[PDB]
Design a binder for this molecule. Structure first.
Ligand SMILES: *[C@@H]1O[C@H](CO)[C@@H](O)[C@H](O)[C@H]1NC(C)=O
Ligand SMILES: *[C@@H]1O[C@H](CO)[C@@H](O)[C@H](O)[C@H]1NC(C)=O
Ligand SMILES: *[C@@H]1O[C@H](CO)[C@@H](O)[C@H](O)[C@H]1NC(C)=O
Ligand SMILES: *[C@@H]1O[C@H](CO)[C@@H](O)[C@H](O)[C@H]1NC(C)=O
Lengths: 196, 594
């Protein structure tokens, strides 16, 4: 049994950062070598787990969150970071036994006319919490006057777009980020590494 | 939520939308400048209309938050830049009249073709013809004809437009809670809110006047030397005791004395420094030129440039298949995109201007982390000063020998250093009195304390005393000689060329002091000096966030324009001039009469 490790990495479209995609992986052989097929990996941080000893442990579940961000926002995909992705779009816990994988996707994503399909949230009443998702698009009033609906002088609709042109710089180019988070609940583990 | 938090949220939403629209507009403009077609013109028109319409709406929604209730400084600066009324204070009819006046002035200056001699079949244009015949001419009669012909036909056209343009601009400036258009322009070198590092819009006038008073003796010695050298070529046309005629300054308006070098070179037998021959013999292209420039910047310590810069910049003219203007300009298109547009030949001048535009690009990348409205130099002279630092450094014979264009057999001597310093003074020092004159005249005109029926009278009387250039023929009031300049006719600030001249030498002195360089300042090399690179980068990354006073102090240690770096830069040349022109009169007489 081989669960879709390849389909998460090799997917035609990737979700927006504000509404990211999370896949629950269970009842599998590990086969982490499929991940290493992609060569141009821009980041392979492995907080809490060895980047070579993955194929010896067993976890109850493995979550593969996949989204698209800028290049200078990849550093915020890490335990303890702060910015606009790490507190309004995608926060990950302080412990976070898992791996963060990001690679440039200026060819698959991005478009000379402007790829506005990839959005992110820049206004919220409170900061996000580890592994929380805010899909709601209600308009974030700036202060002292309700909008009673539509935007206005101090209203302000929260979701902001990227644009992702292919002529952007390396830090402004799209980056498909796949974050692997291993769960170690006190339950019979279902994902294990192969062994003779 | 408080007013300052509302301002923060508004400014962030702005910054994002403005960055997107500015990237679109800059990309359209780059596509046009690399490809002059009609579709590209339409694309620029659409993008510019969108950008201006966005900027108007954002300004009119920024007027809501008062500045008096804001305690932050970065937010205060962004809202101050965004709340600027501009020309919207004027009524619709007045605004459209001002726009038509500006467009007519620009078109008249650009398309101006003068045809006095013979039949109107033979006429010359600005770039090739008039510039070619004014730069290199040994005929006093021809130079006088060209100068008086351009000053008569053109100035008479701009003056009726220029007076009403002045009236409208003064009205707009008064409606903008200022005193005049001169005050509106001086509002760029103004700091308010910071204790210890503050500036006033009249303090700029006082500082500029004091600095010019300090520079004056060097300019008088240079003027006397230029007159003495011009006399040998021009007999019986310049008096021993009087001033210098304006039409014999090389340039059309006498802004730069660079072109007056063939008649002023002291050591004609000693050849001047030039590496074009070795550069073209060593198989050097635009790619190698820019690679060497980036190697110099890396050696200094600044970060290397993006791979997209190489693949997106157009460094060579793509033949005549497509037409593209190749004025060397560095492009900061916004979201991480840095490009350079220039037609790079294998020449020393093109190498130096490659270094200059590369320094501009380095400045642009330095403050790329700043918010959109604070992504600029501390004032409007900082960018040119930063570029000219590296232009000065890359031209040194030590750096040329290190890179390889200069053979080790060549030696440096006092004659060569004097030649180089004379060329530098002709290019650099000779423009400071003219710039100060022009901006003083424009400030006095906008203030309105002088009457209107003697505009040219006061212009010429200030030419006599400040720059030392006299009128070759008398001029009545129907002339508008100042309007013949591109910056005057196109409504541009001119004090930036005065301010950058002081700033660049202040920076060079500071960086060479931090580079542990011993000897003359003109033989300095910021290269291979990570200390100097870090010191320059400290000011480079600030952008417009910190006041220009603090930005200047962060790299130099001073708090305003200082003449001392310029003077000790040109000290060898100044001492040589003092030694050499001791037998000739220094200065210009006030009793000269044609
Ligand atoms: C430049 O303009 C020409 C004019 O037809 C056209 O081929 C195209 O728009 C552009 N081509 C290139 C190579 O930039
Ligand atoms: C102004 O607000 C910015 C918000 O990023 C903050 O970093 C800065 O310190 C504030 N200025 C002052 C003087 O507190
Ligand atoms: C920039 O210079 C550095 C030297 O520190 C070099 O390693 C890098 O490959 C260069 N990159 C480009 C694009 O020139
Ligand atoms: C900078 O240092 C390098 C390595 O020592 C050397 O090759 C180069 O010539 C030096 N350049 C200058 C201008 O001193």
């Amino acid at each position: 049994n081989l669960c879709p490790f390849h389909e998460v990495f090799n997917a035609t479209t990737f979700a927006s950062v504000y509404a990211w995609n999370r896949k629950r992986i269970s009842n599998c052989v590990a086969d982490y070598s499929v991940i290493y097929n992609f060569a141009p990996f821009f980041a392979f941080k492995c907080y809490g787990v060895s980047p070579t000893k993955l194929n010896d442990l067993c976890f109850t579940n493995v979550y593969a969150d996949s989204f698209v961000i800028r290049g200078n926002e990849v550093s915020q995909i890490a335990p303890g970071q702060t910015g606009n992705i790490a507190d309004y779009n995608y926060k990950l816990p302080d412990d976070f036994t898992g791996c963060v994988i990001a690679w440039n996707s200026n060819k698959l994503d991005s478009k000379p006319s402007g790829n506005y399909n990839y959005l992110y949230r820049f206004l919220r009443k409170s900061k996000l919490k580890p592994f929380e998702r805010d899909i709601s698009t209600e308009i974030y009033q700036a202060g002292n006057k309700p909008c009673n609906g539509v935007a206005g002088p101090n209203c302000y609709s929260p979701l902001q777009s990227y644009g992702f042109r292919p002529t952007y710089g390396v830090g402004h180019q799209p980056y498909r980020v796949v974050v692997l988070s291993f769960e170690l609940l006190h339950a019979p583990a279902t994902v294990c590494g192969p062994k003779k | 939520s408080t007013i300052e938090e509302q301002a923060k949220t508004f400014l962030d939403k702005f910054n994002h939308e403005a960055e997107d629209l500015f990237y679109q507009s800059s990309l359209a403009s780059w596509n046009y400048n690399t490809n002059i077609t009609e579709e590209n013109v339409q694309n620029m028109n659409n993008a510019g209309d969108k950008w201006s319409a966005f900027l108007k709406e954002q300004s009119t929604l920024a007027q809501m938050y008062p500045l008096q209730e804001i305690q932050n400084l970065t937010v205060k600066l962004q809202l101050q830049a965004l709340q600027q009324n501009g020309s919207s204070v004027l009524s619709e009819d007045k605004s459209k009249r001002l726009n038509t006046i500006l467009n007519t002035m620009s078109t008249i200056y650009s398309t101006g073709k003068v045809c006095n001699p013979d039949n109107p079949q033979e006429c010359l244009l600005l770039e090739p013809g008039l510039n070619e015949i004014m730069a290199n001419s040994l005929d006093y009669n021809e130079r006088l004809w060209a100068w008086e012909s351009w000053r008569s036909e053109v100035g008479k056209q701009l003056r009726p437009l220029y007076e009403e343009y002045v009236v409208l601009k003064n009205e707009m400036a008064r409606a903008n809670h200022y005193e005049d258009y001169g005050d509106y322009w001086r509002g760029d070198y103004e700091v308010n809110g910071v204790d210890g590092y503050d500036y006033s819009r009249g303090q700029l006038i006082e500082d500029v006047e004091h600095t010019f008073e300090e520079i004056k003796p060097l300019y008088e010695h240079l003027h006397a030397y230029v007159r003495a050298k011009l006399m040998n070529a021009y007999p019986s046309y310049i008096s021993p005791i009087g001033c210098l005629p304006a039409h014999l300054l090389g340039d059309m308006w006498g802004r730069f004395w660079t072109n007056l070098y063939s008649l002023t070179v002291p050591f004609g037998q000693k050849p001047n420094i030039d590496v074009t021959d070795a550069m073209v013999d060593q198989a050097w292209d635009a790619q190698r030129i820019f690679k060497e420039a980036e190697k110099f910047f890396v050696s200094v310590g600044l970060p290397n440039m993006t791979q997209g810069f190489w693949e997106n910049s157009m460094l060579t003219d793509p033949g005549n298949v497509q037409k593209a203007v190749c004025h060397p300009t560095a492009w900061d298109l916004g979201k991480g995109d840095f490009r350079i547009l220039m037609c790079t030949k294998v020449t020393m001048d093109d190498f130096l201007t490659a270094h200059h535009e590369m320094g501009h690009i380095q400045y642009d990348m330095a403050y790329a982390a700043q918010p959109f409205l604070l992504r600029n130099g501390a004032n409007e002279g900082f960018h040119e000063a930063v570029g000219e630092i590296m232009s000065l450094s890359a031209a040194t014979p030590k750096h040329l020998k290190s890179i390889g264009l200069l053979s080790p057999d060549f030696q440096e001597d006092n004659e060569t250093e004097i030649n180089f310093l004379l060329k530098q003074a002709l290019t650099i020092v000779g423009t400071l009195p003219f710039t100060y004159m022009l901006e003083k005249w424009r400030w006095m005109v906008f203030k309105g304390e002088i009457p209107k029926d003697q505009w040219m009278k006061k212009w010429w009387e200030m030419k006599r005393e400040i720059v030392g250039v006299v009128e070759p023929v008398p001029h009545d009031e129907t002339y508008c000689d100042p309007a013949s300049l591109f910056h005057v006719s196109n409504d541009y600030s001119f004090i930036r060329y005065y301010t950058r001249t002081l700033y660049q030498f202040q920076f060079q002195e500071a960086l060479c002091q931090a580079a542990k360089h011993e000897g003359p300042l003109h033989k300095c090399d910021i290269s291979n000096s990570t200390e100097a690179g870090q010191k320059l980068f400290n000011m480079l990354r600030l952008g417009k966030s910190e006041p220009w006073t603090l930005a200047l102090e962060n790299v130099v240690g001073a708090k305003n324009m200082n003449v001392r770096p310029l003077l000790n830069y040109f000290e060898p040349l100044f001492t040589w001039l003092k030694d050499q022109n001791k037998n000739s009169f220094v200065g210009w007489s006030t009793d000269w009469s044609p």
